[PDB]
Design a protein around this ligand. Structure first.
Ligand SMILES: CCCCCCCC/C=C\CCCCCCCC(=O)OC[C@H](O)CO
Ligand SMILES: CCCCCCCCCCCCCCC
Ligand SMILES: CCCCCCCCCCCCCCC
Ligand code: NA
Ligand SMILES: [Sr+2]
Ligand SMILES: [Sr+2]
Length: 297
């Protein structure tokens, strides 16, 4: 049957749509509770939660002797977060970046370049261990700098945590349904293609970031969007790629890493010397479009 594919697909969108808004709302509240910025909650809790698909996908693929899918998924997500996710969000809600957030973005940049350089001959399991350690350090460093918490069964907090978790479950399940529904529609229309079907789940892992960021964008939560983008990329590299490399050596993806380094560099330069708004967003989307037009499938 195919309506099951249609049912799923539509339901996936509904869970994604409402799930994303609840995730954003709950995350914004949690940040106020812990006295940290929206960037910080976006870069830690939101980034890790929405990167769970990438982490499972890369670990699974490398385990199943498909390390090309594992690194392809990780870095492709990174390119998607800056090009598509941040591109759309910048246009919706232009961001002027604070001096301290610029420091966080510069560190992100350094991290990406380091990853690109040690991955020129691919990524070994020791490359993995190192990247994962830097990931852990980035998280502690980010929270520390974004913290002002100097000081308990509060209904405000509990309600905040419930919005967040149910929202997350909503976007993660919604995303799966979207992919699963699309897969079944494709199969019973007999238009299924593996080469393209890998980019259905590849894009699939990026749907949480997309919807969550757009939801944050609609509520002018610019720092949260930026936090979620920066953190998700780091989680995709220090987490998804890294764990992949633990099961098997990952072949180099130098062209894609170069594209990521160029987009990351652009993202930093705009954050430091300008803004992340309309035309910066238009630039990110144009670059993203060119990438999905010309990069190897
Ligand atoms: C502020 C500067 C930040 C850093 C800018 C990049 C600096 C390091 C470049 C190359 C060596 C890295 C050595 C340590 C990490 C790799 C350990 C390793 O196993 O290296 C072999 C390599 O992966 C091949 O197989
Ligand atoms: C001579 C090197 C052989 C390496 C064989 C594979 C080792 C994989 C280790 C994977 C797990 C690393 C976990 C860190 C928490
Ligand atoms: C064949 C296409 C190769 C890539 C053309 C675009 C390169 C990047 C251009 C960025 C500015 C537009
Ligand atoms: Na993420
Ligand atoms: Sr993701
Ligand atoms: Sr290497």
């Amino acid at each position: 049957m195919v309506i099951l594919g249609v049912g799923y697909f539509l339901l996936g969108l509904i869970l994604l749509y409402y799930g994303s808004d609840w995730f954003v709302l709950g995350s914004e509240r949690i940040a106020r509770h812990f006295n940290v910025s929206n960037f910080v909650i976006g870069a830690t809790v939101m980034a890790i939660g929405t990167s769970l698909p990438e982490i499972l996908t890369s670990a699974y693929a490398s385990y199943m002797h498909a390390p090309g899918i594992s690194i392809g998924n990780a870095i492709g997500s990174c390119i998607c977060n800056i090009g598509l996710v941040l591109g759309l969000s910048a246009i919706i809600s232009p961001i002027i970046v604070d001096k301290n957030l610029q420091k966080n973005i510069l560190v992100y940049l350094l991290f990406v370049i380091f990853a690109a350089v040690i991955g020129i001959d691919g990524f070994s399991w020791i490359d993995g261990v190192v990247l994962l350690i830097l990931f852990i350090i980035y998280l502690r460093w980010t929270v520390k700098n974004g913290s002002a918490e100097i000081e308990k069964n509060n209904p405000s907090v509990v309600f905040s945590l419930v919005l967040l978790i149910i929202g997350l479950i909503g976007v993660l399940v919604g995303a799966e349904l979207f992919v699963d529904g699309a897969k079944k529609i494709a199969l019973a229309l007999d238009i299924s293609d593996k080469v393209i079907g890998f980019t259905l789940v590849a894009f699939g892992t990026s749907l949480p970031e997309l919807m969550v960021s757009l939801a944050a964008a609609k509520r002018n939560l610019g720092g949260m969007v930026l936090g979620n983008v920066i953190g998700s990329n780091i989680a995709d590299i220090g987490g998804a790629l890294a764990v992949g490399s633990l099961f098997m050596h990952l072949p180099a993806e130098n062209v894609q890493m170069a594209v990521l380094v160029i987009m990351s560099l652009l993202l930093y330069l705009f954050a430091k010397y300008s803004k992340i708004g309309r035309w910066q967003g238009i630039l990110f989307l144009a670059l993203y479009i060119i990438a999905i037009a010309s990069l190897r499938m």
